[PDB]
Design a protein around this ligand. Structure first.
Ligand code: PCW
Ligand code: CLR
Ligand code: CLR
Ligand code: STE
Ligand code: STE
Ligand code: PLM
Ligand code: PLM
Ligand code: PLM
Lengths: 158, 48, 52
């Protein structure tokens, strides 16, 4: 249940016309906002910044102010074969694919991170493709220098 | 009256056309270098 | 008219070359910045004038 409190500080919601559309996360020293999400971050300090644009990668990030680093969640690059954590349940990792049981995701609810055992961020969910009882997850994934977006076939953005 | 056909276009190899052709060649070399760099970059991007 | 058109063509050529070159530089330097923690390798850092 530590991952939830870690999510509390990291996640700042995106609200458009009063509907939370998606979320943003303070990861490392940036805000992991997906590009498809249209709207306004609630905290002004993150709204007054200049945000980069990326469509192929589907991300938007801006340098968080010096007061936001202490509030940010931690990152990591360990993707060992096994089990990670999520807000709505658990993410099963096998063959380079994040998969969730169907019924755990409605539209919206994009921008929530994926956490390993001891709290280090590993992923940022963008969408997913329905796959039997075990639906997959389009996601932003990262290494030492590279960030890679792995989108399964027939994927919807939720 | 003039005994010629009143042709004032300089030779393809004249000094003025020589300078024009030099400038065009340099600009075209730069443009083709940029084209090659971008096409190699795009090829590598679809490679990855 | 000829000199004006030649100058316009030269300016257009220079602007197109510079813009498409900058597109190549951006396309080559964007993922590294996106990573929460990363170091721009020194080879590509000097090859494309990394911001830091
Ligand atoms: C980047 C460089 C190119 C971009 C700009 C090119 C200019 C075109 C735009 C402007 C329109 C007005 C000028 C018309 C020119 C066509 C010439 C013509 O009229 O050619 C005529 C026939 O055509 C040709 O044989 C060739 C067709 C085109 C020529 C190609 C090259 C011409 C020169 C351009 C290169 C340099 C331009 C300026 C450089 C300055 C450096 C900064 C020349 O026959 P004539 O003199 O006997 O006819 C006139 C009859 N008389 C003398 C009795 C009055
Ligand atoms: C601005 C870019 C796109 C085009 C540049 C064109 C301008 C700068 C150039 C083109 C040809 C030039 C003219 C060519 C020759 C003469 C005759 C000289 O006795 C006075 C200047 C004058 C009249 C020049 C003035 C500047 C001029 C009009
Ligand atoms: C590339 C674009 C901006 C066009 C540039 C044109 C420049 C290189 C050229 C075009 C016409 C040229 C002018 C034509 C005639 C004269 C009059 C002469 O007594 C002194 C030089 C002067 C004033 C030239 C200076 C250079 C000049 C302005
Ligand atoms: C007319 C001469 C033809 C020879 C062309 C030589 C090619 C230029 C040498 C180096 C090209 C590398 C540029 C591509 C950028 C490398 C980084 C990357 O792809 O991510
Ligand atoms: C942080 C922002 C970075 C942008 C500025 C620094 C990098 C720009 C490159 C340095 C200047 C190069 C000279 C102009 C480009 C030449 C293109 C050309 O004419 O073919
Ligand atoms: C016309 C003169 C010769 C043509 C070759 C000019 C060489 C230009 C230098 C190449 C550009 C630098 C390579 C890295 C560019 C990038 O991908 O950002
Ligand atoms: C003049 C602008 C381009 C129009 C001419 C198109 C003909 C050449 C084909 C384009 C390159 C396609 C090869 C695949 C490489 C790539 O996807 O970039
Ligand atoms: C006419 C004499 C030479 C003038 C032309 C010189 C060409 C300059 C080279 C431009 C290439 C782009 C420069 C940036 C490359 C980089 O460092 O990343």
């Amino acid at each position: 249940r530590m991952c939830m409190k870690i999510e509390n500080d990291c996640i700042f919601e995106v609200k458009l016309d009063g509907k939370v559309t998606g979320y943003a996360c303070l990861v490392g020293d940036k805000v992991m906002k997906p590009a498809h999400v249209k709207g306004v971050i609630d905290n002004p300090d993150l709204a007054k910044l200049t945000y980069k644009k990326s469509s192929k990668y589907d991300l938007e990030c801006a340098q968080i102010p010096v007061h936001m680093k202490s509030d940010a969640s931690k990152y990591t690059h360990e993707k060992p074969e096994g089990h990670y954590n999520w807000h709505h349940g658990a993410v099963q990792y096998s063959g380079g694919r994040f998969t969730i049981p169907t019924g755990a995701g409605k539209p919206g609810d994009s921008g929530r991170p994926i956490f390993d055992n001891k709290g280090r961020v590993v992923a940022i969910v963008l969408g997913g493709a329905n796959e039997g009882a075990r639906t997959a997850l389009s996601v932003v994934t990262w290494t030492k220098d590279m960030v890679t977006r792995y989108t399964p076939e027939g994927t919807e953005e939720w | 009256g003039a005994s010629h056909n009143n042709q004032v276009f300089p030779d393809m190899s004249g000094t003025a056309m020589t300078w024009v052709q030099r400038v065009a060649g340099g600009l075209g070399g730069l443009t083709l270098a940029a084209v090659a760099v971008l096409i190699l970059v795009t090829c590598v991007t679809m490679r990855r | 008219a000829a000199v004006s058109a030649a100058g316009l063509a030269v300016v257009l050529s220079l602007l197109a070359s510079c813009y498409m070159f900058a597109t190549a530089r951006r396309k080559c330097l964007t993922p590294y910045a996106l990573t929460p923690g990363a170091v721009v390798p020194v080879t590509l850092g000097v090859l494309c004038c990394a911001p830091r």
